[PDB]
Design a binder for this molecule. Structure first.
Ligand code: NA
Ligand code: NA
Lengths: 286, 286
């Protein structure tokens, strides 16, 4: 108390010794991550440029921007893992998971940056997209929100693990759905395949967050969690309807708003709480 | 000065943004690491037991203690990477390498622990070996030496990177040669195959340390480096001739002492200095 009464966070003199495994649930998630290892080089991008060139300008604009957003957000997730989560959690099985997540985030960032480089030849445009946190207003609200949770010296691990589940689970959900929409339109195999791998990985990262949350003795209240999750949903809805409208690629903004609330509800249930919006998933393709 | 004039260590606002790659040499080492990814599950240990059971009791003693030394030392290397190197180095390319090295060390540590579990069924003997830092006098000198460099609040990155290159390159060298000796005897293919994979990784980790060292503006002196390396050599020689004699598996202690000095010279040259001992490699199998 405050942290000595938390198995996840309390002193572990065996933290750097791997065996024997004591948290089999946590360990199995690390094994799952390790088993689905992939590299950017495995994704075949050789059919994408033709499809990219056939797109309308506004579609290319939307796609390049979603890519820039993902690449930038990964860096924030990564920073939080490197500076906070991988340091403060003292159980070996979780340290292994977080260590592997850091490695996978670098691969995700590389994949996005390689997609940018493949589609966008102009070096000034590449640089613009790489520096999205500073160059792109659409990205700011989400980036600032995530970064505040890294700098927050008060917020408990319980609150911060929820916030990052919201980053990887709510902040990414609209953009993931967007690319699955492109798949439904039969467009850009490399983008859509890499999107399958990455959203799968991110789903696993959110599942892990929920597992860690359940292992906590002093959780934040349902009220506090609702508050964090609702805030995140509103930011994500703003991003997809105002800052970078999904209309640009032919999607229904109204149904997209509903999808984000469905996603949040599922996260809430997975965190062991009650649904908040009680809406259906409007997308058959998700 | 003192850190703000070091490109590896000075403020990098772009540190969590992956592209563009600016340090292509550092980046290529990360790509090499990434391309050689493997998991313990790829190593078949099933054909080892028969050979294991045919050894003399003191050969089994020697091997299990080497395994336990390796698993323990992995956790110290890992601790240093997690708490220090991956935090203090500000260039993205090296941060990616170190992130991937943390993951691989966890895989090494699992491999060593699985080798132990496979060869040793007795749960008391397993626990003895997993807790080697506390239970096994033969590892104390190396463990303490390595751990001092993590806790040293005054030593420079330049001195510590050398120290950990000595850990991964000198403290491991005799044990790797021990296992390569077992291969020459045609014994235990699982052990010796995992040893090939791990020694190769550790070789890369040492190469990376040398690359980082070359990128430093303020390096420690040749004399200071010599002192660190010579000290490491003496400790390793003690380990292999006195604390856990390689005689126990039919190797010559004098030729082993000479091999360590050869390894140290090669590292000295790789660091950009002169030879120290000027001895040949006594082992044709290395
Ligand atoms: Na442990
Ligand atoms: Na960078």
């Amino acid at each position: 108390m405050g942290v000595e009464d938390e198995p996840l966070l309390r002193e572990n003199p065996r933290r750097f010794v791997i065996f024997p495994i004591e948290y089999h649930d946590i360990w199995q998630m690390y094994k799952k991550a390790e088993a689905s290892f992939w590299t950017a080089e495995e994704v075949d991008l050789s059919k994408d440029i033709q499809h990219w060139e056939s797109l309308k300008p506004e579609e290319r604009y939307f796609i390049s921007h979603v890519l820039a957003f993902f690449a930038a957000s990964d860096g924030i997730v990564n920073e939080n893992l490197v500076e906070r989560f991988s340091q403060e959690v003292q159980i070996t099985e979780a340290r292994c998971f977080y260590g592997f997540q850091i490695a996978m985030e670098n691969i995700h960032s590389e994949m996005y940056s390689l997609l940018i480089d493949t589609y966008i030849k102009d070096p000034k445009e590449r640089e613009f997209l790489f520096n999205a946190i500073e160059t792109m207003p659409c990205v700011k609200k989400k980036a600032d929100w995530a970064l505040r949770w890294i700098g927050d010296k008060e917020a408990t691990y319980g609150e911060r693990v929820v916030a990052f589940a919201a980053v990887e689970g709510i902040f990414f959900s609209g953009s993931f759905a967007s690319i699955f929409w492109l798949k439904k339109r039969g467009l850009m195999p490399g983008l859509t395949f890499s999107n399958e791998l990455i959203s799968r990985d991110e789903g696993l990262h959110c599942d892990f967050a929920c597992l860690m949350f359940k292992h906590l003795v002093h959780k934040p209240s349902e009220e506090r969690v609702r508050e964090i999750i609702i805030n995140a949903v509103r930011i994500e809805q703003e991003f997809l309807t105002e800052a970078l409208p999904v209309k640009l690629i032919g999607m229904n903004c109204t149904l997209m708003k509903q999808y984000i609330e469905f996603v949040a509800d599922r996260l809430m249930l997975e965190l062991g709480f009650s649904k908040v919006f009680r809406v259906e998933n409007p997308f058959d393709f998700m």
